[PDB]
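In this section we turn from sequence analysis to structure. A common task in structural bioinformatics is to predict how a protein folds when a small molecule is present, because the ligand can shape the pocket around it. The inputs are simple: the amino acid sequence and a SMILES string for the ligand, here bdaGDP. Study the lines below before reading on.
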Amino acid sequence: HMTEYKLVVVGAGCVGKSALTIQLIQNHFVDEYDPTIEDSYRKQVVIDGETSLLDILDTAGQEEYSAMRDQYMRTGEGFLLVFAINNTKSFEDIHHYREQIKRVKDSEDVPMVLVGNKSDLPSRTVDTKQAQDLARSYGIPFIETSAKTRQGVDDAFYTLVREIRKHKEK
Ligand SMILES: *CCC(=O)NCCCCNC(=O)O[C@H]1[C@@H](O)[C@H](n2cnc3c(=O)nc(N)[nH]c32)O[C@@H]1COP(=O)(O)OP(=O)(O)O
């Protein structure tokens, strides 16, 4: 009838985790800190014919090694690993987030998608083939997004749902 999916968004400060969440759930964007994140946690949508409830867990505001972040990683069925294409440090941080999920889950088979956000901005510092190479070594897809123009937003979240379905189907 309906299927629920627990999706967790991780990544460094200001990469756009919350803006991506609000765009998906509310079809809304503002170029400032957006307090409507407090009301943006579930989207009901049909994906490939199936009525799906997407519950989005946003790690924004959590310390790097907090107990609530650990709970988020235990609960999540799939993870968006977000960096910003104009922030080199946020791309270098991706290894840490991947390792933290793998250790908390005690598994090497966790559904994940690598997301390069802020693709609408000029003067990038992270090149696509750098991210494509990383995603290949993880065995996961890579998707370029903009929370502002909505580029790739449905692609990123629905691709993660499809990865979860493949995992559940053995
Ligand atoms: C964030 C650090 C900083 O000082 N930025 C300078 C502006 C400060 C106020 N503006 C702001 O915080 O904007 C948000 C968001 O609107 C913007 N953002 C997010 N995604 C995109 C995008 O795809 N394209 C463009 N042009 N802007 C985008 O970045 C900041 C932070 O976004 P967030 O979701 O709050 O970040 P977090 O990962 O949840 O911490």
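Residues 153-168 form the longest helix (16 residues). As an exercise, try to locate the residues that line the bdaGDP site and compare them with your own expectations.
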